[PDB]
What does this fold into?
Amino acid sequence: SADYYKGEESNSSANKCLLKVAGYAAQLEQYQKAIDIYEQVGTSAMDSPLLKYSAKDYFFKAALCHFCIDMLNAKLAVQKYEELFPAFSDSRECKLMKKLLEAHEEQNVDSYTESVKEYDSISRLDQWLTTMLLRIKKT
Amino acid sequence: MAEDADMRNELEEMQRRADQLADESLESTRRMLQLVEESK
It folds into this structure.
């Protein structure tokens, strides 16, 4: 369906189909496709007037989907985004990621868990995010 | 001392009043932040 929509030059609809595809693919423990789709959608939506405000969110997902592979490639990944989209630094996702990285760098599971609890308390977490955070915590 | 004792007891009741007021303001601010976050 996304291929057909792209072939019909009807944008903003194939994007949703690709987002669904990436979200479901990230569930099957195959992260490369999810990262590619998330980054492509985020960079595409960065320049749109209306969609701009949502762009940040996409990046965060990729970062989480990028954290399982290995922690080293996650840190660097964040940098690559922040230089490209400086306003990303303002959102809570950057601070949460930095705190989680600092907590994990020393096997401090308790600090990671407490930060996750606080962020969930301020705003309820999604099942997808809950599952992915649990998976990351296993390490 | 009964005069001072009773007046100090009212002062203690007033301390409880102040604590209640401060805690109520704090809780109101927390709910404040929650709703403001929700709208976005």
Summary: Chain B touches chain A at residues 33-34, 37-38 (CB under 8 Å). The two ends of chain B are 60 Å apart (CA to CA). Residues 1 and 24 of chain B are 34 Å apart (CA to CA).
